[PDB]
Design a protein around this nucleic acid. Sequence first.
RNA 1: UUAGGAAUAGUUAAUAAUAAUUUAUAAUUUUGAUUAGAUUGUUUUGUUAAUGCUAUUAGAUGGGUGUGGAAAAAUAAAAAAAAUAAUUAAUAUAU
Lengths: 170, 212, 180, 203, 413, 226, 124, 162, 50, 89, 108
Amino acid sequence: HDTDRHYWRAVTDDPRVQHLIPLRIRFKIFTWVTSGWEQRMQVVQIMAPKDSTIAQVKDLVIVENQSPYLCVSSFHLAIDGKELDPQKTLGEYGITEQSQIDAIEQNDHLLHRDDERPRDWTVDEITAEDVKRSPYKEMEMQPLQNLAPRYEARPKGYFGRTYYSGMKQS
Amino acid sequence: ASLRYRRPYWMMFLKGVDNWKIYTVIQQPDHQRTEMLYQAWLGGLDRPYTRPKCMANQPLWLSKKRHMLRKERLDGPETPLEKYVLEWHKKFHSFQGTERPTPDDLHTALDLVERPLDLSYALQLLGQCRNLNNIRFAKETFLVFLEACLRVGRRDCAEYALEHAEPLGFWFIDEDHRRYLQGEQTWYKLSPLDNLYYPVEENAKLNEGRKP
Amino acid sequence: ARAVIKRRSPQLWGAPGAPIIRMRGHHVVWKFQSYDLVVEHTHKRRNSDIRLLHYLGKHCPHPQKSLWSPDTPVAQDRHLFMLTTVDIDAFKYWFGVKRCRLSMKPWALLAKAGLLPPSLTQNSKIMPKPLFDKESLMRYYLANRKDEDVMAREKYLNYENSMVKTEEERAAERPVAPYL
Amino acid sequence: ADMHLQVVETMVGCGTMKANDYFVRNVLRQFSWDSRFLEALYVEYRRQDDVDMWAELTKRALVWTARYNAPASERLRRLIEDDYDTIRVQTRTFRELAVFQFRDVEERRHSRDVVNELPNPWYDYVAHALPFPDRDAGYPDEYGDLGQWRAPGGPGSPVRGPGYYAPPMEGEHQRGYTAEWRDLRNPMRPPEFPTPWERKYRQ
Amino acid sequence: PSPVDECLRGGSSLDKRLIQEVRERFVSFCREYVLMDTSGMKSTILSTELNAGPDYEHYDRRLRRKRHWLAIRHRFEDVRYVIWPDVVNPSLTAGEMLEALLWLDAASTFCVRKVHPSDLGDKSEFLPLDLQREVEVVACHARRDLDFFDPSATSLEQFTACAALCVNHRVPFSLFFPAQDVCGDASVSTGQCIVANAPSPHTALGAVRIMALISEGSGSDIGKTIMFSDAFGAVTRFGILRGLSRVMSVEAFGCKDALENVNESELCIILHFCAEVREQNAAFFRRYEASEEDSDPQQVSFLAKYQQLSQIALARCKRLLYHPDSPRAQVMSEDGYIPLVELQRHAEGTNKAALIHYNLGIRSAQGMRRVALGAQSSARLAELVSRLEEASARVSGNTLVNDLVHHLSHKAA
Amino acid sequence: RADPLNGGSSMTLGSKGSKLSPEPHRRRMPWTAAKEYVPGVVLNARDKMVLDGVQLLDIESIDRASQLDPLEVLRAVVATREYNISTGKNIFQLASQATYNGRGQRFYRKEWQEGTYDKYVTLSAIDFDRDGNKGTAYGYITFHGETTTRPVQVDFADVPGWYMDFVEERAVPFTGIVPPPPSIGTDVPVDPHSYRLKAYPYYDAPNPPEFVERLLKDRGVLPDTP
Amino acid sequence: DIHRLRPTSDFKASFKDWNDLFTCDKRQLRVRGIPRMTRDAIRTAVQAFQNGNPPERFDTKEEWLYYKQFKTVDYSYRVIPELPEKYRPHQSGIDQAPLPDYREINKMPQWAECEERRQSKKTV
Amino acid sequence: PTMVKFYHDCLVRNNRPREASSLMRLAAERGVHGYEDKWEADVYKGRPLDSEVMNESEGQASSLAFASLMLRGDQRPLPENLQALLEEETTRNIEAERSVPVPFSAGLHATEINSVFRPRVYRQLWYKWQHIANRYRPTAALKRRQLAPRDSPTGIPGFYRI
Amino acid sequence: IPQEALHWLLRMIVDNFNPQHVHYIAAMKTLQSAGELDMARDVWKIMERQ
Amino acid sequence: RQIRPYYNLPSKSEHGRKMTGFLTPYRHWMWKQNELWRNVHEAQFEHLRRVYKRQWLESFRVNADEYIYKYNITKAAQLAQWECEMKEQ
Amino acid sequence: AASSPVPHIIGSKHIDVPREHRLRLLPGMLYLLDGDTLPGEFTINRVLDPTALQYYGRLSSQIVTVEAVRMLVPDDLRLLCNCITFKGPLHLPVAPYASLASLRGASQ
RNA sequence: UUAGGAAUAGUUAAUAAUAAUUUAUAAUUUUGAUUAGAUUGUUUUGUUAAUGCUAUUAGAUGGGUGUGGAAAAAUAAAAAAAAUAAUUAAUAUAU
Ligand SMILES: [Mg+2]
């Protein structure tokens, strides 16, 4: 239970504050119609930090797709057909929210990933083991079904017939 | 009414020992000498040995050795049937054995019957196949059993199987074997290679000629 | 869960078990015997300075003369009196919120007070036990069963809360024209 | 499951008599389906040709509630209740009916009773549930008396100082021991209330 | 008083069994010193013990270990020419002389360091021994007999120990091997002789020891030890390539959980070895790993082994970083004694679900720790992971060095 | 808990039941899981009054002087078989005398078909040990038409009291795999003329009149008199 | 009559008839000369029969007499065997394991000799 | 009798039952007090000494390798290739059982557990010649409050201190 | 019952603790998820009276 | 205590108890009848349990908000008096 | 695979990882091939035990018939392969967009 | 707490150290230690004008079994112990 916090702080300080961009990245998918296959678009939205590189954006797309049919092979990020250098920052390309980013796949390969980083990893190192969701998707406050409501069963000083003092100093 | 808190935890579900109060006080030096002198009394060990602290019975390696080292009760087999009984006990009566016998192996024990003492060794192997090993007999098992009882001239054991066959395990008995032992027929088989009715005391009456 | 079990007081599910409302006695003669309705554990704590959870009251099993008969004569006033004191709120807290156990003698004593129905062991020996058959029970259930929403609102009033505000009170709780 | 539920309700409402096969093939073994699937499917079971097919399909739906850990809702049991004269499928347990009859007859004779309609303060409410009483009963005393050497009592005692004479105190203890602590032995004035509950109880 | 005092009291030293008994008693003395239970023993300067020794009640806590080390020194000065005679058929084999030298070095590394004013002897005796002659005598007796080093695991530990004795005591390791494989060379180093004659390790820990001895045996010679390529990418020396390929063997680093028993300090050795191999042969790696196909069957095996070792090392770094003190981040000892299994085997289970000594056996195994990254580990791994990449890569966008830096700042705050 | 009797109800300790949960109440004792058990005292103790006047022989005693007459040996084998059969029929004693070791046939306990109880086991595999009256049996459990997806171990397969009816159409050879019998709701369509449910959830059997008469005579409602 | 320490059937002469048995309370049972456990058993059996429960319980005398012969302290239906001072044959004076006479047990029995004589008679 | 009590526990601890059974057989024949009732039979009557087997093994050859093996008389050896493979089975099985530690012993035999020894002088006794190594008497020999009443000193300063 | 979500806030003030904003947020969201809107307004009035 | 009637299944065993717990179907049926007659009482018991629980919670609610109102008035007056004394000091 | 297109469940050959990366990448991976072609550097052990073959009863009856179950153990004894050979056609209806529609043994 | 008052130690802190091969000018004590003696404590008792003197009987228990959630386990008039055994009353025990 050592979560590196032994007091009560109701506010959030600067090391947990991140500056994020809602980057949405398109994928070329194929759906079956009565005629045959039709090419459509599947969009995966991530919150990437502003000073991140494009390889980090690709890793964020890999860890936040939650679909077994999208990240099936090694893909590459591109804008208007021109491929992107994965060792460059998003600010070097002027990538904004309205910039259309596509993911071109090579289905002959097989993407072998090893998810050792948890999905909700912040600086304070508090991770859930059964999280199964991006932290931007989950709600802030929800009902706790794992705990159990417990009332006070041990009286301190008052036990019976007449409340004279109640042994309040104890 | 459980012995969970009266004896140690390794004696959980423990039944069938001689006395489980022995193995709670083994570590005392007057009883620890008694345990090591008992292993020398049982033999099979070249060094002084004590059984483990959390074991009441003998270990599986030690009880296998004393079962293998144990001399057989039948020493000096005269007949090749009695040599097959000693091979039966090394194969189908080993310590913690897994393999079951075969109805063809019962036919091998029934084909070596020479003297009337061999039939008592053979029919007791037939009882282990039905009761102990629970083996369904073959279709020709009563055929080998019938001719085994006729070499030693023992007909009263052959007709004893007809009045109750399914307690003995003979699920197929052909009608000519039933007519022979009950007295309806006077022969039980027709030889394909000699063309005569067995036994040979009936062949002198029925078939006066020799045919291929 | 001991090697040699305490032969005189066996219990269930180890110590300290569920809290139980008992009527404990004193080590005196019967002529001065009184009972304490207490809340304790299933196994009695003899290694503590806190030997009980809560003290619900005292029952006197000896009948007293009615010393208040010329105050206001009502029906059956000049009979004898059985004096008992009962902590109502602590009993309801340990009964509903904490879900204590009950012995049959405190159950009968609290059924005399109107807090509980009469116990299971208080047998009318002239009336035998009922005999159930599912066909007559189904016929009575299909003869008159309540509505679903009416039964749900009855359970909501009995179990969840009983002070639900009317529309005339919601019209009074809302603010007025300087803020509305 | 809510996507398959609309398909099952559409196949029931169109009267195609094939919603049960879709529920078996797609929703039964591989989904955590709730009880309104069978509330939809009971109307499709009702439209069968013979009554025995209706009966066996309803009983098989009850066995499906038993096996796949999906308990039957109140609406489904009330739907099977209304056709008990035709199907004779029992939809309540042996325990709930014996509770229901003994509760309903007692509540009817209790509502018809004119004597026991009076309120009972022992039964109707809880008078007080706070750990401390709402008004001062005078106690504690917070002073010693004759024959008492231990003052303050320490653990589990409300006495704070000796009754008559004390070693010299400073600060808030000096103001407390002489003026501001409790004193129930004062015959003229009770121990005081906080502000502003002393002005309106001056007389 | 040691038992070796009764063997040097005027006996016939030319006898073989007397030399064997001297060696066995000195081995027993050094092993009793090394395996001494030092739980209650304490060494603090007490003023009342100035003009005397320690107290009679405080003999076993204060005087015993210091007297044991001084007896070890005073018997080493009398014994070291009997077990290890000067170089001119022998009385002792090379293996038992190696065992005696190993226990002597283990007693010398853990000598008593604190010098009290009570001690009448010199403080220089509270320093470790110089065993430069004995390693040369053991190497001369080990190159005399063939097949001293075998592909067995015990011979792998003996190879690690002999290379350790040659690194610590300034002895060339090529003396442990015959001169015909050192013929044709003007000078060879210790680490080159390690990387040229290393056997294939069956565990990851033996490979970690070999990769540590390679780095420590060549401090400034770490460039010449592991350079097997030119400045254009062509392989210069295939002997170093065959040594470095069989260091990172498939029996050691082949499994997905091959680094399950690697601590935070051994992972630094693994990443330092990978970074040194990448830095010394950068023209080979940046040519061959990107878009180059090679026909040499050894180079593809070396490249696959290096990629596998670097990937499992980065996976172990992410294991120790992102899951601190986790049950999947716990380590254990190789061939470690887990006594619950041996207690279940040598008991009679009438019901196999009832496991005896369960509350103690499930807690206890041979050394098993919850592993998290400290300050000295994280500050070194943040350098080594950045060393694993190329110079043209941006260290800002690396998502593992930044996580290590933020972990350092969060655990320091 | 997972499954309490009558929910939480603690006016008496008998209202909770004789067992508080179908799961084991402690983790260290998995054998305390709630399951259907079998009266092994009456069943495992066979009648020794059929072995009287019959000379049995030990296994190790193969010396010549301890051998018996072959007619006495045959009546000893008949008496030992009658001793093994005297209480009931085992699974391993019924499957040995069947084709393909009885694979695919339906085995059932005596009380598995009376009342409103309907349950059998379609046999899938049996591993006989050297003592052929014991072993380990496997099968698909069928309870009121519904069937398991995988073969489960048949509990109390060594205790006698089992029955089967041999059907040649259900026999599966050793080359093939015994298929699971179909669930009557899921796999095959539901037909009331083929299989009709004896019991269902929220159903209880009607009261027999002899049990009603016996309870009203025991309670004293009906005038029981000698 | 179920318990050993409640000899209920020993007081048949202490009652006149059925009504005398079912009208006597515990004070009248104390007057008639019945011990405390026996009169408690009689009164509880009468009160159970009045409530609709006839005295149909298993007599636990012989089961408790079986469990009495062991050295359990709390009479908790366990089996605790007694351990004597000598539990091994070697400390009872027996020097070694008994050797069976392999020449005497491998002789042919008398029925086998009679059958061999019958075979020699019928073969010739 | 104190020497026989110590020497029996040392031979039991060091896994020597032949030397311990011969010690009980010797003390019963010599008339040592406390051991006239304990007399053990010699189960090693036909077996030779343990040192004589190791001398014979260094230098009938089928019986030379199996001279250490103890038989009941109703047991027979295996063939020499089969018995030698069985003797290595028991060799690796005995050391496998003796290498497992008992979890609550602190690495001690049961003889070592609760075996604290001080001479007879530590508990209200002085020199006697026949008590060579006399264990100090237990604390139940002298109870307090039977030698002196309550709130009164007793002349036993170091009695109950072990 | 959902009324306990109103109870454990009240016992927070009887036991002389200052309820933080997260406690009011949790109480109002737990009472809104159970459909108790008047109890959520009671939590808001409790926050205003503090 | 579980009743062992005489007409249960007897265990003919000299190594344990002489009567098992295996019933008769009539015993099963009458035990079910007694179970239902206890189930009525335990239904009323649990009903009164939940009724008393919600009664205690409602009473705690009302008394708690009254105490909160009075204590807020008291602490406001106390803080004002403390601020005046601090100004004088 | 008979109702939806699974991406990498059906290949044209065995996946060719190097011999050093064989133990690291292969466990946890599944793919279907056409015909009974076994990978090299394995020892073929056919499962003939009826106690071990009984658990494919629902697989062989309601889906494609199980012909042979083989366990492949390599030279280093560290990477198993459970090879099950089915015989078509499927008893389940196969979608045209499914993965098993691209298999000749499943479509015929 | 001792009518005749002096030394004590499996020892103190640090620690990448579970399971301490290291470091230190270490720790307790004349403001009364350790040991030895007496020794359950406790505004519950008694007395008196008495903040004085004088009494006490709730309890716990590192080698008996690593079982059990917890050793408290070799014996206790109830603490009723998994089907309403009995719940009218008094003796409730001798019996
Ligand atoms: Mg240090």
